[PDB]
């Protein structure tokens, strides 16, 4: 193709700049517009082409990106689903496999339809038909929708969270902040529970007004008070009255996820377009005694200095603050690069089992620990090594090296002030 | 009773994931500080007040054989480092593994400040290379 | 001998005993020379011979086959969904002494590199090159007598085991032995049987390994104390 | 089984360092908790599984593992005991036999 | 194992198109940057940032026998130059060739800076020539 | 931790289209501007006022080496601008390239402003020019 010499298209949009950072988003979702069980965008303008403007799969993303700088990417997870059918068909499968159906003038049409498609040899064996009506996976599908004035249409998430995100883990492992579109009291703790066995933060809301009331943890039941009696260090729960159908937990993780791991805090955090926390009675911000209330459920809520809205603290339901978790799972995740890019690239040699071997691994795992140390996240760090002269044999046989500890400590950051002053003649 | 013998054969040296060997038969390493702990200041009248200095910075002095094959690896990973952006990192801890604990001091984000001089007669000449160090930190084992 | 394989019946079931594709009836014979790689691509595709190239170029003994990097190989995929294989995968792959090519996160990596009799690749083809060189510097002093005798005395004898250290000190060199040892007869007690047919027995060595390290296992903790 | 090409398991628990030297300790105890006349623990988590707070056996046990560095190892033995029973069961013996009466 | 042998025998010197010969009984070659890879800064506080210097020229010399026949070409070769114009290049690298590796640097663009002292006795004395060069590089064999 | 590393290498000046190299040993580039931000006035009673003055001009001297052929090029240049009418424009902005960050400042309508003292001697001295800027900005990567 010929090009000109010089190209300039200039525009009129302004734009904003991105960042990256550590740890990426992922919104679960139920979903059918898509057949994969992830997919990732990089803008919302990419979102809004799969979605439409009232799914929650829009507004999750819509929330996301309001803060400034953006985050690099999103992931979109699907949910498993089952339809069904009543009186007041298309039925789809995984490959495109569609095949429509049709009985002409409930029961009795109900049937029908069950024997026309358990009768098809193309699409039957990958769906499942009962009797209203159910259509549900079958086999390998992992894919199945249902569409369509004489005969009606629903449907609902049709899975735990353990088994969907099982399903989701078995596809991409690359993100790190997870949110939900579900919540309900029992998908929330089961989800509470499985992410607590893996390296990942779970970031939820809420707006359950008998969070507001009651100072002893001991007898409140709510779903903020599960969570904190549970210690489930690696879940972020937030009270806003908007946590119906609204996402702000997206713009709190856009809040800092642009940034780097263990080098700034959580609390006191500045959202822009997220109003305060309001009783949903009479639309006032909480008293000092509901904000207490949330404050011994370890729950965050969105506080006003006065004039300006602030979420408080940032601390996880088991009292550990969130920059200390993110910080340590950083901190695994360089020195796990660390030493996988010494072991490789040994294209050609060897690391022997002696001292000789040994010491060249301390020394990338001290490399690894004083890039932290740089960063202020921690203070100082000791290591610990066995020597090669004490080996078990069976491990130089396994060719592993066990054994090796270290330790550090942390540096802390400062949130709120008290003040005491005088005023006289003399 | 007598203190721990001293064994040249079982000390290692190793900085940027590489082990250095191959030492020099006479003096094949050295750690000093930049400048001392406190400068005292006396006045005409004799009084003395103490200035503690921050600088902690020093330098390793490491010193290998002619033919030694740690040479090469040196310079290969020299002629890298000339070609990276400067907001690249060059610096890395080195480690000085000692048994007998007549060592000290480690070097805490060393770089390579000189290349070593070449020369050749009838016999072997050592070569001689030395690093920096943001802090030579002094460590023991608490009694 | 090198090959490849892309049965999916290989990725399920731990119990070596039940499983019969062809990895499990490897391992079962305890075929120690056999090397064995899963991938997908191994239809109509030949990474084995990726592989061989990866450490064929070097010398015999002195390098290890895990962790190899392969320029223009992709990891193993899951044939019905095409993602990187899930550790139970890895773990039905690993008790039947098959390679694979596993992740580190964002690097693919050939890992273990063992065959099916549990024996490292290294130390199979390190033997090998031993032998090989044992007989090369036997056979260059046996030859080259073109005008003289190795006498069937102690003097003939001691000249073998010079020989024979020799070659020995050649893989102590290397790293791959550390230690060994040398044994020879006396002519004093030779049958003459043997000194008739003009061959010398009951020579013996021994050695001993080196060694290498692949993998780490690592603990630490963070406190304000 | 496989396992990562490197394994990093980090805790938020400080830790603190043991000492090895001449003797061990035995605390002989009044107890029923385990059949074996003398038995072995090496921290106090073991310890707080066979026996309550509120037992002299652990007391003991707390404040040997207070100072720094710690003993590696300490012992339990077991005193002889006698039951008796009045009027304001269940009879166990060595090896698990155990018989229940009633009237 | 042992390191590779080193034979003065089998190191040969050439510049300019010719073989510079006749090695003296010690020390017949140096090699040398003019300034360090690196400088450090240290403020009053402790804190520290590098300076990467540019300049990477150097030193080459070589000094041969008293009566040996090379002093004579670089004599003829000398002469020659001081009757060229300026435009005229008087430059050319300076290769050693070392298969025992122990030289690890060659001479971009070296020039003749010195010519040697001379002096008599009962006795031989050597001749010192030096060099300058562009840029003294350093190289090995990649491991 | 420490601060960015500096590298003269790495340091490009332009101006009118055309990259200017040959940097000189010492000093190579000054930037400076002409007149404070703000100039106080006390009072016989104590009082304070300010004033906040509104010059922004500045200076920019790069100096070069004696035989650069940087210095062919602005003289080519200059002559050029003598032969042209005042109402063709001769400012162009003078961008300097830093990596390390370590400039702060860019000249906004620059113009030539001096031309450089020649001397000879027995080594090589340097020459150095001058501009204006209409407004030496002083900017920074927003923390």
Same mark, same amino acid.
């Not at chain 1, 803060?67 to 690099?72: A, E, L, R």
């Not at chain 2, 030492?23 to 003096?27: I, L, R, T, V, W």
């Given at each position: 193709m010929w090009n000109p010499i010089v190209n300039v298209d200039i525009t009129l949009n302004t734009a904003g700049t991105t960042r990256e950072g550590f740890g990426l988003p992922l919104f679960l979702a139920s979903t059918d517009?898509?057949?994969?069980?992830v997919r990732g965008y990089t803008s919302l303008t990419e979102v809004a082409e799969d979605f439409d403007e009232n799914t929650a799969a829009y507004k999750a993303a819509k929330q996301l990106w309001s803060?400034?700088?953006?985050?690099?990417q999103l992931y979109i997870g699907r949910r498993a689903m089952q339809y069904t059918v009543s009186i007041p068909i298309t039925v789809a499968a995984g490959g495109g496999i569609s095949q429509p159906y049709q009985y002409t003038a409930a029961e009795n049409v109900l049937q029908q339809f069950k024997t026309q498609i358990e009768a098809d040899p193309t699409i039957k064996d990958k769906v499942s038909v009962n009797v209203t009506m159910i259509i549900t996976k079958a086999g390998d599908n992992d894919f199945v929708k249902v569409t369509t004035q004489t005969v009606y249409i629903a449907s609902t998430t049709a899975d735990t969270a353990s088994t969907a995100l099982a399903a989701i883990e078995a596809y991409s492992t690359d993100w790190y902040f997870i949110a939900a579109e579900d919540r309900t009291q029992q998908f929330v703790l089961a989800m509470a529970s499985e992410i607590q066995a893996r390296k990942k933060i779970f970031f939820t809301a809420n707006s359950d007004?008998? #969070?507001?009331?009651?100072?002893?943890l001991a007898s409140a039941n709510d779903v903020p008070a599960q969570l904190a009696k549970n210690m489930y260090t690696r879940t972020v729960c937030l009270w806003h009255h908007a946590a119906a159908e609204d996402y702000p937990e997206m713009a709190y993780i856009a809040y800092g996820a642009p940034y780097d791991a263990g080098?700034? #805090?959580?609390?006191?955090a500045q959202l822009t377009g997220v109003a305060a926390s309001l009783q949903?009675?009479?639309?006032?911000p909480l008293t000092s005694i509901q904000k207490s209330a949330l404050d011994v459920r370890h729950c965050n809520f969105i506080d006003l200095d006065g004039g300006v809205p602030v979420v408080r603290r940032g601390i996880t339901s088991g009292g550990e603050w969130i920059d200390i978790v993110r910080g340590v799972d950083w901190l695994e995740s360089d020195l796990k690069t660390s030493l996988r890019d010494l072991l490789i690239n040994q294209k050609g040699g060897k690391i022997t089992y002696d001292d000789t071997g040994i010491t060249r691994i301390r020394q990338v795992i001290e490399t690894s620990l004083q890039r932290a140390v740089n960063r202020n996240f921690l203070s100082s760090y000791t290591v610990n090594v066995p020597k090669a002269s004490q080996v078990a044999l069976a491990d130089k046989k396994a060719r592993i090296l066990k054994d090796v500890t270290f330790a550090g400590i942390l540096a802390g950051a400062i949130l709120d002030v008290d003040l005491k002053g005088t005023v006289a003649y003399e | 009773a007598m203190y721990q013998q001293y064994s040249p054969k079982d000390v290692v040296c190793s900085w940027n994931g590489i082990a250095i060997e191959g030492?020099?038969?006479?003096?094949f390493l050295r750690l000093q500080r930049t400048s001392p702990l406190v400068t005292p200041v006396v006045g005409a009248g004799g009084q003395v007040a103490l200035t503690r200095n921050a600088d902690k910075t020093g330098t390793i002095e490491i010193e290998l054989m002619q033919?030694?094959?740690?040479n090469q690896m040196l310079s290969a990973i020299q002629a890298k480092q000339?070609?990276?952006?400067?907001?690249?990192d060059i610096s890395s801890n080195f480690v000085i593994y000692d048994p007998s604990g007549s060592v000290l001091a480690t070097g805490i984000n060393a770089w390579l400040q000189e290349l070593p001089q070449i020369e050749l007669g009838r016999d072997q000449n050592s070569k001689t290379w030395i690093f920096g160090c943001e802090k030579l930190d002094y460590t023991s084992t608490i009694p």
């Open positions: 517009n898509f057949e994969e069980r803060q400034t700088p953006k985050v690099t007004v008998t #969070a507001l009331q009651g100072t002893e080098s700034i #805090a959580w609390g006191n949903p009675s009479n639309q006032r | 030492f020099a038969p006479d003096s033919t030694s094959l740690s000339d070609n990276m952006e400067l907001e690249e």
